[PDB]
């Protein structure tokens, strides 16, 4: 347990999954300046996504690796992971449809997926783990209950997240539950219902101190602190993540949860690149953003992080593909784009090019 920042005094384990993707990406880059910059990216900590159940054994391999690094160097390792396999996943979109279906034993399959993750963690208990819990799940219950799939997935999302939280907390994993972003849950009308909902999940999950708080901006592109206001944010007083967090935090406290936050800035380097705030799929000309750091602009924020690993696609732009979503066909999307989660070379090259602050060789 701990009252304070779980990232404090730890080396962050560097994703080998992402390192190999970056190394292969770098090998194909013409420009030697862009090549040397691309290579710097694998030294920047990212989160490791378990978006499919066949990846669960990889966790044991990562924990064994981090354990061996810890024993060899004497330096404490922290492994950053994402839990992302709810049944009827991403109910308002087709892009990240998911392997588990509520029509086909999805809930029980999901509990087994969590149990599999837990049994790897039990195998290697000497390394601290920070887990992001189920991006693009509960945020849907606030604003998207007009969608048939979301309405049908509600009890499953709650039960699934609560179960994930209870199993991981028992093992001393630090959890941050996904809480959308400023252009989703930051709108004044959505603030109180969000604080209510996440506080409820926190209660049902036993109020364990290992349930540290919430993760924002996962797989999105919002500024943490906007020097200049992006026009796409007009109408919303919370036009950046800091404003969103500062608006939501005191509401959470009164609802019985003094929650902390982490903020994705992995693709936040270039602002003003969206026609609508709701456009999220492979947004064209994005850049790597603010680097992971514990030097944050608020007491509520444990860390700036890179959760979504830049270069992995958000969704396919192929109109004939089963998982095609209209958001991935928009004029401000990078096209042609491959399936969600797969390597998107052209996009990564722009991320590197457009890095802000710029990447060093």
Phi, psi of 263 (to 5 degrees): -130, 120
In 143-259 the beta strands, taken as DSSP E runs, fall at 174-178, 211-216
Element (H, E) at 271: none
Angle at alpha carbon of residue 61, lines to 12 and 313, rounded to 5°: 70
Q: What is the dihedral of CA 312, 218, 140, 275, to 10 degrees?
A: -80
DSSP 8-state code for residue 335: S
Q: CA 100 → CA 55, 58, 113, 340, 345, distances in Å?
A: 14, 19, 10, 16, 28
**Omega before 336 cis (within 30°)?**
yes
Contact 63, 56 (CB under 8 A): no
Angle at alpha carbon of residue 225, lines to 352 and 19, rounded to 5°: 30
Question: CB neighbours of 51 closer than 8 A, spacing ≥ 6?
Answer: 82, 84, 85, 96, 341
Output the six-digit token pair for 322. 């089963």
At how many degrees (to 10) do helices 148-170 and 188-204 cross?
50
Distance CA 242, CA 304 (A): 11
Point out the residues that are catalytic.
Answer: 136, 314
Output the six-digit token pair for 228. 């200049």
Q: Which residue is listed with tokens 């080998």?
A: 16
Phi, psi of 11 (to 5 degrees): -80, 135
What CATH superfamily is the domain 1-361? 1, 4-beta cellobiohydrolase (3.20.20.40)
Q: Which residue is listed with tokens 């159940």?
A: 53
CB-based burial label for 76 (10 Å; 0-12, 13-18, 19+): middle
Distance CA 105, CA 101 (A): 7
Resolution of the determined structure in angstroms stands at 2.3
Contact 83, 50 (CB under 8 A): yes
Measured over the CA atoms of residue 207, residue 212, residue 213 and residue 216, the dihedral's sign is negative
Contact 240, 223 (CB under 8 A): yes
Pairing of strands 174-178, 77-83: unpaired
């Amino acid at each position: 347990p701990s009252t304070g920042n779980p990232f404090e005094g730890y080396d962050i384990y560097l994703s080998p999954y992402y390192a190999e993707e970056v190394e292969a990406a770098a090998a194909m880059i013409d420009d030697p300046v862009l090549k040397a910059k691309a290579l710097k990216v694998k030294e920047i900590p990212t989160f490791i996504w378990f978006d499919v159940v066949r990846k669960t054994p990889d966790l044991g391999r990562y924990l064994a690796d981090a354990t061996a690094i810890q024993q060899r160097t004497g330096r404490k390792q922290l492994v950053q992971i994402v839990v992302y396999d709810l049944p009827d996943r991403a109910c308002a979109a087709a892009a990240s449809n998911g392997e588990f279906s509520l029509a086909d034993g999805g809930m029980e399959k999901y509990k087994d997926y969590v149990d599999r993750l837990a049994s790897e963690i039990r195998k290697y208990p000497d390394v601290r783990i920070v887990a992001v819990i189920e991006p693009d799940s509960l945020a849907n219950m606030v604003t998207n209950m007009n969608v048939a799939k979301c309405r049908g997935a509600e009890a499953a999302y709650k039960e699934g997240v609560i179960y994930a939280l209870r199993q991981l907390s028992a093992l001393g994993v630090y959890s941050y539950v996904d809480a959308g972003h400023a252009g989703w849950l930051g709108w004044n009308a959505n603030l109180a219902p969000s604080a209510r909902l996440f506080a409820q999940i926190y209660k049902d999950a036993g109020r364990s101190a290992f349930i540290r708080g919430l993760a924002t901006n996962v797989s999105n592109y919002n500024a943490l602190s906007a020097t200049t206001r992006d026009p796409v944010t007009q109408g919303n007083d919370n036009y950046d993540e800091l404003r969103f967090i500062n608006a939501l935090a005191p509401l959470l406290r009164n609802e019985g949860w003094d929650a902390k936050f982490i903020v994705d800035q992995g693709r936040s380097g270039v602002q003003n690149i969206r026609q609508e705030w709701g456009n999220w799929c492979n947004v064209y000309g994005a850049g790597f953003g603010m680097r992971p750091t514990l030097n944050t602009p608020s007491s509520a924020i444990d860390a700036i992080v890179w959760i979504k690993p830049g270069g992995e696609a958000d969704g396919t732009s192929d109109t004939s593909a089963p998982r095609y979503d209209t958001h991935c066909g928009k004029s401000d999307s990078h096209k042609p784009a491959p399936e969600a989660g797969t390597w998107f070379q052209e996009y990564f090259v722009n991320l590197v090019k457009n890095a802000n602050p710029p990447l060093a060789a």
